[PDB]
Design a protein around this ligand. Structure first.
Ligand SMILES: COc1ccccc1-c1cc(N(Cc2ccccn2)Cc2ccccn2)nc(N)n1
Ligand SMILES: COc1ccccc1-c1cc(N(Cc2ccccn2)Cc2ccccn2)nc(N)n1
Ligand SMILES: COc1ccccc1-c1cc(N(Cc2ccccn2)Cc2ccccn2)nc(N)n1
Ligand SMILES: COc1ccccc1-c1cc(N(Cc2ccccn2)Cc2ccccn2)nc(N)n1
Ligand SMILES: COc1ccccc1-c1cc(N(Cc2ccccn2)Cc2ccccn2)nc(N)n1
Ligand SMILES: *[C@@H]1O[C@H](CO)[C@@H](O)[C@H](O)[C@H]1NC(C)=O
Ligand SMILES: *[C@@H]1O[C@H](CO)[C@@H](O)[C@H](O)[C@H]1NC(C)=O
Ligand SMILES: *[C@@H]1O[C@H](CO)[C@@H](O)[C@H](O)[C@H]1NC(C)=O
Ligand SMILES: *[C@@H]1O[C@H](CO)[C@@H](O)[C@H](O)[C@H]1NC(C)=O
Ligand SMILES: *[C@@H]1O[C@H](CO)[C@@H](O)[C@H](O)[C@H]1NC(C)=O
Lengths: 211, 203, 204, 207, 206
């Protein structure tokens, strides 16, 4: 703050974050799962198949977590900096019903806050297999997207689904063939017969309609 | 906590040889492959081609990666570039395997390594009778590309209802796997591969 | 100017001072980043889906005057791979494809410390196409800003078809680039963005 | 087998192996053998004269500086091809990048032979006329080095096809009739020297 | 006949990487670097009559010299293959390309012992150009601008030069190909940038 556009300060913070960050290791502070907070803000619904139950969409994946080893006294340093994600540890998030690669359309940077929180918001385009039934009714279709960690169980990573549907058309495209009805993010946990340990995910329920 | 996990990752990088196969004694390295399908995206009966998504459940061990986890974590997530991985290939594939998931493996304390990419990939196989109640049966041949049977053995394993999409255009009747071997006129040595047979039909 | 030795040394100097991940802010002032798009063709237009497939030259310029040298007996500009430089993390907010880059990824660094960067980009967008079969034409807006830097770190300044292709199915009516400000009911600080207005139509 | 034997052989290869320099022993060209074994014909366009196919590029050449005594050690190993010199093979009538569908590894034999066989999907312009008849279409593919003279790289075409059935998809909408490979040396106004290739001729038709 | 001393080739390659400067224009004598560019078309695949776009495959014959790479070819090879990773290469771009160039060949060059570098990627790119009368006897006449992307004329000068490499199975034939020197000057920047106009005149067959 104040002296925020201090280039030397910024260089040093980044040097520090690199001396300290370990990108392949989960920043479990203590014992608790890393609380990974995830929220999708959709931008567009591009392609929709009534027949094959497949949607093409574009969403901003608002993602956050803390690694307080990264932290620093921002008394006379800047409050945040931007850091290429290849430098930081990043939750290994994935969509379990994804049917195409997550396509990132944005620079792969993240903000680190002086308190050790990281804000990561990539713009993603991706296809899913989900219920497209009734997309032309006016109760609308409801497409459910499941996202959590691919390899870290619940005692290692937990998903917080805190989200608001009020600001939703601050994000969505005025020019879509579709319109958003509601977005519902519910936290739940999934186990698997083969395997111990429950994996936290957020279930993002996308309610939408052809205009 | 994470200084343990950090140090376990250091040990893995010390010992691991991502390019050399971890042969115990003079035994083959035993690889378990088990496909659990999630989607069947496209199917052509005129060309005999299929576009599927599946979780490739894979396990083997390297005991040199093992550690005493009395008072340290039991497993850790590790980037597969740091480990040896079986060089597996679907012999009858017709697209590159597109991996949909972070390329991370789980390394267990005993030296077991758990790796399971979600894969999207296209195959040429028998689609005759997809529109029929008895369904088409498509076999996918997965084995090692460079290691013959004395270096790598591929052992199948395993139920399917817990993975496959309800919203699919198709349903799964049955998925069965069997160990198979591959030889060639030109080439001495046999190659193990698992034959996954996907029996399926339109809803 | 072309004395090769001067050039290898200027590039060595730049790689010593260049901090490719750190913003070149000076005097606790933002980095000023002029952006201007020069459209080069409009390849595919879809009026049912409101998507446009365009190819454009993105004139980008800003300065880091630590990179400066005394060119009194030295070349005034050099070409420098952008791997070696900080670059504004520009993104198009209503893009729907990743920016496919058709050109060598070099920049020109000028002895005064100004950096001239201009990639040819083909990218699909979600914009307004209604009226493209009308003489007043479609108007399609593209919003470009920094992805992670708010206004106090990065500013984006605003500024015919000397560039546009004469073999496109479409003709350009006008282009206007106004500097608008973005905030969200979410995050405190404003983001500086240049809204580019492309008014164009089909020929007939 | 024996892991540290295998590790050590890898170390040895990475000491001696020069991935960017041709392995010319006793000053004559590197012989490269090339055998294509088609796995499927996925798409043919009869009017645009283009075929899309899948094949196994059986490639072998020798690099004797790579050799070791295999009395009490493995006979071959697997090696990532980026640790090795590979021939710079190209298909002159290819109209798409080669899409390698398999692990990019090779087998180094203890006599210094390299064994490399990528599975490849590529599109070619060739003759697809008569694909619906039964003398068939014959699609000629031309492969050779992109930058090396016959004096630097030589191309062995030796090739059987009695075993075509072992490779080709039974479920293809086409059937192979024959595949013959002929060496062929080409000169260029550009350059003094001639560059060898191999014509592969894919005589095929629908079923 | 000493083209094959493998150790000799190792050392030349060693010498090249020591002297080479992959990100520095190799300007001799305060000359601009002279780059010859020459296209030998191979195919024309997807001509679209309405969008006015064509899809071509062509071998970009490209050459220039860097005398600092030169060695005595007296008792050593005349040329060597070298990865372009290790050499400077002109930042050439097709100004009216609407797709990225897709290089279909190993990205190597030949360095001759005089410092001449021969570089020829086979390329497959999509262009926005005049495709009027493709199925007439006059043909379509599609022109392609290829120049340095960041170097002006005092830095790089681009110089020009049948149908001997064009595919007979193409649905098109080549009438003529002409290549002209050219400049350019934008109401934006002072200097002029040299380019090459390549004029491909062609038509459907029959
Ligand atoms: C509360 O919502 C969030 C939760 C977690 C992480 C990020 C956000 C977030 C950040 C955010 N910006 C900062 C930011 C941080 C980091 C990366 C990119 N951006 C602002 C902004 C402005 C213009 C383009 C893009 N992003 N904007 C929105 N809508 N949400
Ligand atoms: C027999 O089962 C296996 C055999 C070998 C390897 C993996 C498995 C396995 C692991 C597994 N998970 C852990 C894991 C290990 C490693 C990588 C990713 N995941 C659970 C889980 C849950 C939610 C998303 C993802 N993975 N889940 C399933 N179904 N199978
Ligand atoms: C206002 O003009 C600009 C502002 C900022 C950055 C670049 C430009 C600019 C540069 C420019 N050239 C130099 C250049 C600099 C750097 C990179 C590429 N090119 C000339 C030229 C000519 C033929 C192809 C390409 N570029 N041309 C145009 N029209 N604009
Ligand atoms: C005459 O045979 C060849 C000549 C030259 C190069 C390779 C071969 C070759 C090798 C070969 N295998 C070894 C190998 C070496 C290297 C890479 C992959 N494989 C076995 C095998 C069998 C099933 C799938 C994969 N590979 N199989 C066949 N059919 N041909
Ligand atoms: C006037 O001719 C040229 C001018 C400038 C640059 C290249 C050439 C050139 C070189 C050339 N060959 C050498 C070479 C050098 C380097 C890379 C690839 N090849 C021969 C050859 C052989 C087989 C495939 C391809 N090219 N062939 C043709 N047609 N043109
Ligand atoms: C941060 O630094 C300031 C220096 O003025 C100091 O007063 C303050 O106590 C420090 N805070 C912490 C938590 O160390
Ligand atoms: C592992 O280490 C613990 C102490 O850390 C020791 O008591 C034990 O004997 C060791 N071995 C096994 C198999 O637990
Ligand atoms: C640059 O150098 C020249 C001579 O080397 C000198 O005359 C001049 O004062 C220096 N500084 C500037 C800003 O030109
Ligand atoms: C191989 O090794 C053995 C023992 O090291 C040695 O006696 C022999 O001469 C070597 N060469 C051959 C061809 O056996
Ligand atoms: C090397 O070059 C020099 C001068 O360019 C010449 O005198 C000599 O004949 C050449 N060959 C050898 C072997 O020195």
């Amino acid at each position: 703050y104040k002296d925020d556009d201090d280039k030397l300060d910024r260089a040093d913070i980044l040097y520090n974050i690199r001396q300290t960050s370990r990108p392949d290791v989960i920043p479990t502070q203590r014992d608790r799962p890393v609380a990974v907070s995830v929220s999708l803000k959709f931008i567009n619904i591009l392609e929709v198949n009534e027949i094959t139950n497949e949607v093409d969409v574009v969403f901003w994946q608002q993602t956050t977590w803390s690694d307080r080893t990264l932290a620093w006294n921002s008394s006379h340093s800047p409050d945040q900096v931007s850091v290429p994600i290849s430098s930081l540890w990043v939750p290994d998030l994935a969509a379990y019903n994804a049917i195409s690669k997550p396509e990132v359309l944005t620079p792969q940077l993240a903000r680190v806050v002086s308190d050790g929180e990281v804000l990561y918001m990539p713009s993603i385009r991706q296809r899913f297999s989900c219920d497209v039934s009734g997309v032309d009714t006016e109760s609308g279709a409801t497409c459910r997207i499941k996202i959590g960690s691919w390899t870290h169980h619940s005692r290692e990573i937990s998903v917080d689904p805190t989200t608001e549907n009020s600001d939703d058309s601050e994000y969505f495209s005025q020019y879509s063939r579709f319109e958003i009805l509601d977005v519902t993010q519910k936290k739940n946990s999934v186990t698997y017969s083969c395997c111990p340990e429950a994996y936290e995910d957020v279930e993002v329920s996308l309610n939408f309609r052809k205009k």
